[PDB]
């Protein structure tokens, strides 16, 4: 993600305390800080060789993953860098000795290292409060095929 229009804000977008020296022209020309978030999550190579800034990224941003790891299904991608996932679960009523389908909608920060469409299952990790409602950050996108290539037009 070295392209696609990073400097689109009123302020200059950069990572803090990652200095590019204009004097010393060593052949990288854009430094990029990254970390591995831990807990067995691969740092994506789009995060590695990207150019986006995203101060709430788990890899290139100032937040850390610690606490609850959840999984969920993406039901909305209409906010900027934020998604809503759906956590379906079965709740047990003892009296009838039976279950009922409940669900929770969890708003989750998504980095531009991940390309999420709706209908995808993502693994989200707990961070510090990002917004009023957001506390989780996409650490892994677990969509593979989707069963859609045999819906395209043929001869």
């Amino acid at each position: 993600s070295t392209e696609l229009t990073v400097q689109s804000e009123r302020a200059f977008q950069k990572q803090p305390h990652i200095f590019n020296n204009p004097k010393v022209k060593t052949s990288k020309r854009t430094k990029r800080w990254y970390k591995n978030a831990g807990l067995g999550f691969k740092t994506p190579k789009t995060a590695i060789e990207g150019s986006y800034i995203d101060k709430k990224c788990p890899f290139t941003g100032l937040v850390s993953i610690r606490g609850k790891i959840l999984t969920g299904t993406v039901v909305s991608t209409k906010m900027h860098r934020t998604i809503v996932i759906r956590r379906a679960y079965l709740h047990y009523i003892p009296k009838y000795n039976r279950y009922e389908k409940r669900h929770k909608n969890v708003p989750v920060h998504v980095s531009p290292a991940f390309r999420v469409q709706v209908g995808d299952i993502v693994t989200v990790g707990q961070c510090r409060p990002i917004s009023k409602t957001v506390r989780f950050n996409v650490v892994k996108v677990s969509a593979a095929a989707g069963k859609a290539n045999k819906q395209f037009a043929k001869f």
Partner: protein, 260 residues
């Protein structure tokens, strides 16, 4: 609300102090100190409710303000001073030294030790950090900060503290084979060294421990205190060696030891 609580209701006290339900609304709230509120034993509970040397709290105060008692070498004239695990209480009259260790029912037993064993205590390393000017220190389970430790000392190890100067004499690593004393949970007060240790990145590392009668039990890593190698512990051990017999074995022993 509005600030720190200064009282402790009886029935909100820790159950291992064995306070009688009646005879007061209030339990002695442990002061701030080396150990926690619930992991420790106040001096009034030790001197009135264990040794029976004092009948009141006023007699505990009269004992303490004569500088007879000392905890870990220093005098501690506080009535509700939080004496906890591995703490050494020295009563000068009758020349008594005690090490606070759990009996295997989970409570602080009275364990009389010698003057050689009263010279030292053991401390589980809670963290290893650099202080300022680059000086390394370790932080033990009783709030001690010891500067310039051995660089082999890592977390969850056990140092031996000399208690005349707070210095590390020797230390025991945390690795498979070496004794474990259990200082929390429901296996509280048990002994049995090892099976292995499972890691669980993210939280709550677990230790498998198998005592001398081959009963395995799992404990969290934070409840695990190294006391030595398998055989020859660095401390003396209390009455029972941390075995946790079941209730049928307890009754089969208690019926035996009452008819001579």
């Amino acid at each position: 609300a509005r600030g720190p609580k200064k009282h402790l209701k009886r029935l909100a006290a820790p159950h291992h102090w064995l306070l009688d339900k009646l005879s007061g609304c209030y339990a002695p709230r442990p002061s701030a100190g080396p150990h926690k509120l619930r992991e420790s034993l106040p001096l009034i509970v030790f001197l009135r409710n264990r040794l029976k040397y004092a009948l009141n709290g006023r007699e505990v105060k009269a004992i303490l303000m004569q500088r007879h008692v000392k905890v870990d070498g220093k005098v501690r004239t506080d009535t509700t001073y939080p004496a906890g695990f591995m703490d050494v209480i020295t009563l000068d009259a009758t020349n008594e030294n005690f090490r606070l260790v759990y009996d295997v029912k989970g409570r602080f037993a009275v364990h009389r030790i010698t003057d050689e064993e009263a010279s030292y205590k053991l401390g589980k390393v809670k963290k290893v950090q650099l202080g300022k000017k680059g000086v390394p220190y370790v932080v033990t389970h009783d709030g001690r900060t010891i500067r310039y430790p051995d660089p082999n000392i890592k977390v969850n190890d056990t140092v031996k503290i000399d208690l005349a100067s707070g210095k590390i004499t020797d230390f025991i690593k945390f690795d498979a084979g070496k004794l474990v004393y259990v200082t929390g949970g429901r296996n509280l007060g048990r002994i049995g060294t090892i099976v292995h240790k499972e890691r669980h990145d993210g939280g709550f590392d677990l230790v498998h421990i198998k005592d001398s009668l081959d009963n395995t039990f799992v404990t969290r890593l934070n409840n695990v205190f190294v006391i030595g190698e398998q055989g020859k512990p660095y401390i003396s051990l209390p009455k029972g060696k941390g075995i946790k017999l079941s209730i049928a074995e307890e009754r089969d022993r208690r019926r035996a030891q009452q008819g001579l």
